[PDB]
Design a protein around this ligand. Structure first.
Ligand SMILES: [Zn+2]
Ligand SMILES: [Zn+2]
Lengths: 231, 54, 207
């Protein structure tokens, strides 16, 4: 219940510029923002600090969310939009055909067993678009933008959703792709990368499989077949 | 008597500040990071959810 | 007008201001009123006021009018930008380096520069208006279109010169986001001098 002050503003500006930040960098940013603006730094009050911002951001349909990276298990903070309306559609980052390709790529990532789409698969999606066609060079430049802006993560020409993207689109994915999105059987959140039961298909986050099966004869929580993957 | 500005001396000093024989790959970023401290620019808000038409 | 519906409009105006700032194009008051405030236009001064206060208090952003006749706004920073302030370094960082060099030449040469003088200087920085640049791409378009539509620069025909020629001045956004004295301080720092070394430009920056 602090009054919002310049330390909060400085923190919000930095997070706006990054979109997403890892937890240890956020703790250091909190400290630095307090020092830059002569606010007493309290190592035990980061939640209250973020909470001040979120109270004021709530009527703007913005929030600072926390999440966990599927790969690295690290905590991330992200400034996310929380509304779909006529004003948010005025965003100027990407053209309509570019966002069509983003949506089809996201859909393939959601459908895939591995959680990654390959370069060739994205080129084939682009060639199937019903909008203005994009050349290979344009697709490659667009993918590099999606990586630079932390919507996609890219590794050796394969792409998955960035933690930032999952954090912002968590509920959008759950509702738009309810027939196909993986919902972790342990934590009940969207899983992009996962371990799947090879008998019944249910997914677990890799971190959730390590916790749930931490057991010499591990079995699927849904069909009781022995778990085929390593914990 | 007016203090005349020398643009040739200026670009020589910029190149030194940027890192000298070719320019480092981060030369313009280095210059821009210095320049930001002289501006009052705001960061901008970017998102994906809600940007789709429709 | 219920206070709930007015509160909702204030939030929408804040959202609109942020989203319309994404590429640093100025924001017309008339577009805020027409596109967002709509049937609440009888109280548009209160609504834009409350949105301005929200941007100040939550973000540390200042609403500033850069053209009094057309009433067009920009957002400037109330917080001092410093080394280590936490902001991301990206492609817009590099663009500001280029813009600052151009603003420097214009100011140091008496607040106007011919287009030819700007490209002559930039050539020594390995920039050519007609060749794609590894950092900036189409630099002719960046300097003569993007910076101009952002109002960082003015790009004006030189009057009465029979083969058409252009000259540059600072735009309205430059005068609000930086200052002559700040640019003089940058130029002085680059050249390992003191701002008072440039007596003529120092006096111009004080007035
Ligand atoms: Zn899980
Ligand atoms: Zn099973």
């Amino acid at each position: 219940m602090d009054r919002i002050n310049e330390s909060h503003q400085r923190f919000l500006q930095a997070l706006m510029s990054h979109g997403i930040m890892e937890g240890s960098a956020v703790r250091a940013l909190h400290r630095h923002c307090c020092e830059l603006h002569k606010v007493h730094y309290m190592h035990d009050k980061l939640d209250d600090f973020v909470g001040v911002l979120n109270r004021h951001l709530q009527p703007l349909f913005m929030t600072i969310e926390k999440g966990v990276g599927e790969e690295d298990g690290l905590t991330y903070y992200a400034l996310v939009n929380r509304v779909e309306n006529d004003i948010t559609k005025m965003a100027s980052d990407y053209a309509e055909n570019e966002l069509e390709l983003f949506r089809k790529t996201m859909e393939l990532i959601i459908l895939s067993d591995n959680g990654f789409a390959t370069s060739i698969s994205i080129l084939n999606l682009a060639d199937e678009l019903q909008s203005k066609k994009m050349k290979k060079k344009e697709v490659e430049q667009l993918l590099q933008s999606f990586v630079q802006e932390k919507w996609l993560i890219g590794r050796n020409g394969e792409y998955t959703l960035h933690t930032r993207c999952i954090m912002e689109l968590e509920h959008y994915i759950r509702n738009t792709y309810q027939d196909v999105a993986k919902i972790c059987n342990v934590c009940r959140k969207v899983a992009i990368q996962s371990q799947l039961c090879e008998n019944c298909g249910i997914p677990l986050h890799l971190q959730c499989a390590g916790k749930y099966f931490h057991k010499a004869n591990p079995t699927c929580p849904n069909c009781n077949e022995s778990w085929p993957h390593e914990i | 008597h007016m203090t005349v500005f020398d643009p040739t001396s200026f670009t020589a000093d910029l190149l030194s500040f940027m890192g000298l024989g070719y320019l480092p790959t981060d030369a313009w970023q280095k210059l821009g990071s210095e320049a930001e401290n002289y501006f009052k620019r705001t960061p901008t808000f970017h998102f994906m959810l809600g940007s789709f038409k429709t | 007008h219920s206070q709930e519906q007015v509160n909702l409009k204030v939030g929408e105006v804040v959202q609109y201001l942020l989203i319309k700032d994404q590429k640093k194009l100025p924001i017309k008051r008339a577009d805020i009123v027409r596109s967002v405030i709509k049937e609440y236009k009888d109280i548009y001064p209160e609504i834009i006021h409350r949105a301005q206060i929200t941007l100040q208090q939550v973000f540390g952003f200042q609403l500033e009018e850069i053209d009094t006749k057309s009433h067009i706004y920009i957002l400037t920073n109330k917080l001092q930008r410093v080394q280590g302030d936490g902001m991301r370094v990206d492609e817009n960082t590099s663009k500001l380096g280029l813009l600052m060099v151009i603003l420097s030449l214009i100011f140091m040469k008496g607040n106007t520069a011919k287009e030819s003088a700007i490209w002559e200087m930039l050539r020594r920085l390995r920039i050519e208006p007609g060749e794609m640049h590894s950092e900036f791409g189409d630099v002719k378009k960046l300097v003569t279109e993007e910076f101009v539509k952002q109002k960082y620069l003015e790009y004006n025909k030189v009057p009465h010169i029979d083969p058409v020629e252009y000259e540059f001045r600072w735009g309205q956004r430059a005068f609000k986001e930086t200052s002559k004295m700040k640019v003089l301080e940058f130029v002085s720092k680059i050249q390992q001098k003191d701002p008072k070394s440039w007596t003529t430009q120092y006096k111009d920056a004080q007035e």
